[PDB]
C-alpha cells in the first residue's frame, strides 16, 4: 500500500458527491471530472489543476463530456479518475459517479505498482461510491458502450444525454 490521500482530494470528493443549494453564477464552476496524481516524492494523492473538467462548460465548449475525457488521460502513465455520469435507463433516469482506474501497459512498473497497491487507500476514503471501472487498454476505455455496460449493463439505453 503505502501512499495515502491528502486533504484536498477528500475535500474535492466531499464537494462533488454532496451538492447543496447554490447560486446560478457559482453553480457553473463545480467540478465535473477530476483526475488524481502523485507528487515529486510519491507520497500523497494530489489532483492536478491542469487537467480537469467543469460542470459549467459541459454542453458548451465541451460537446461531449466523455469524448473529451478519454484524450485527457495520458497514455504513458497511470492515472485515477472520477466521472459524474448522467445516463438514461429504460427504467428511469439516474445520475451517479464513476471511479475509473486508468492503467495502461505502456507506463513503467514504478507507476503501475504504486497505483495498484494503493488503490484500497483511496477507494476506502471515497465513501458511498458504487460504480467501479477498471480500464487497462486504451481501446476499451475509448469505447462508449463499456460505460453503459459497467453502469447498468444492457439496461442503459442512453448515456450522457444521447442514445447509444
Amino acid at each position: 500500500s503505502g501512499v495515502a490521500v491528502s486533504d484536498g482530494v477528500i475535500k474535492v470528493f466531499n464537494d462533488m458527491k454532496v451538492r447543496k443549494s447554490s447560486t446560478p453564477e457559482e453553480v457553473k464552476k463545480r467540478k465535473k471530472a477530476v483526475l488524481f496524481c502523485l507528487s515529486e516524492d510519491k507520497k500523497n494523492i494530489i489532483l492536478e489543476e491542469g487537467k480537469e473538467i467543469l460542470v459549467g462548460d459541459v454542453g458548451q465548449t465541451v460537446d461531449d463530456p466523455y469524448a473529451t475525457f478519454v484524450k485527457m488521460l495520458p497514455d504513458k502513465d497511470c492515472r485515477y479518475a472520477l466521472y459524474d455520469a448522467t445516463y438514461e435507463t429504460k427504467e428511469s433516469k439516474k445520475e451517479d459517479l464513476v471511479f475509473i482506474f486508468w492503467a495502461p501497459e505502456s507506463a513503467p512498473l514504478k507507476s503501475k505498482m504504486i497505483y495498484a497497491s494503493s488503490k484500497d487507500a483511496i477507494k476506502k476514503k471515497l465513501t458511498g461510491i458504487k460504480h467501479e471501472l477498471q480500464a487497462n487498454c486504451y481501446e476499451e476505455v475509448k469505447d462508449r458502450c463499456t460505460l453503459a455496460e459497467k453502469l447498468g449493463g444492457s439496461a442503459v439505453i442512453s448515456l450522457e444525454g444521447k442514445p447509444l
Binding site: 454532496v18 451538492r19 433516469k93 439516474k94
Partner: protein, 166 residues
C-alpha cells in the same frame, strides 16, 4: 428551493428531488456486517444481509439512520439542511415509528421542514415507483407547500406534532 422525496420502502429506497419523472437513487435497503456496506456495494460484496424494515415498521434504528445518511451523502451528494425532505409510510403504522422518523430527521440532520405522507395516497396521486411519482408530483404543488412541519413549529410541540398534523 427543491424538496427531497424519500420513499423508504421495505425492499428499495427510492430517493430523488422534486419535479422530475424518475427517481435517480434506487438500491436495496440492507446493511451488511463482515462475516458496513449499504445498497449496491452490499449487493456486490462475504456479508450477512438483513433488512432494517420488517413489514413496514423499522426494526433497527442505527442502520436505518445509516441508510438515510448514505442516500443523502454518498448517493445524492446533498445536505439535508437545505432542501426539505418528504418521507412515506404505510397506513395502520405504529406511532413510535413515525415519532422516531421525525426525531431522527429533525435532530440528526436538522431539516428545515418535512412531512410524513401515506404511500398509497401518493401512488394514487401519480395516477392523476408510483409512490415516488406521487410524492414528486405532490411536492411541486403550491397548496401543499404550507403544511410542512417546520423546526420552529417542532420545538414546542416535540415529536408529537406529526400525529396532529399529518
Amino acid at each position: 428551493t427543491t424538496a427531497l422525496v424519500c420513499d423508504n420502502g421495505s425492499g428499495l429506497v427510492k430517493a430523488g428531488f422534486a419535479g422530475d419523472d424518475a427517481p435517480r437513487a434506487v438500491f436495496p435497503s440492507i446493511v451488511g456486517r463482515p462475516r458496513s456496506y449499504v445498497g449496491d456495494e452490499a449487493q456486490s460484496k462475504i456479508l450477512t444481509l438483513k433488512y432494517p424494515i420488517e413489514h413496514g415498521i423499522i426494526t433497527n434504528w442505527d442502520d436505518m439512520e445509516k441508510i438515510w445518511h448514505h442516500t443523502f451523502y454518498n448517493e445524492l451528494r446533498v445536505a439535508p439542511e437545505e432542501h426539505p425532505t418528504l418521507l412515506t409510510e404505510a397506513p395502520l403504522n405504529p406511532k413510535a415509528n413515525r415519532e422516531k422518523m421525525t426525531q431522527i430527521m429533525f435532530e440528526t440532520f436538522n431539516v428545515p421542514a418535512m412531512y410524513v405522507a401515506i404511500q398509497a395516497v401518493l401512488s394514487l396521486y401519480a395516477s392523476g415507483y408510483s409512490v415516488w411519482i406521487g410524492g414528486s408530483i405532490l411536492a411541486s404543488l403550491s397548496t401543499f407547500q404550507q403544511m410542512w412541519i417546520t423546526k420552529q413549529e417542532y420545538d414546542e410541540a416535540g415529536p408529537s406534532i406529526v400525529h396532529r398534523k399529518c
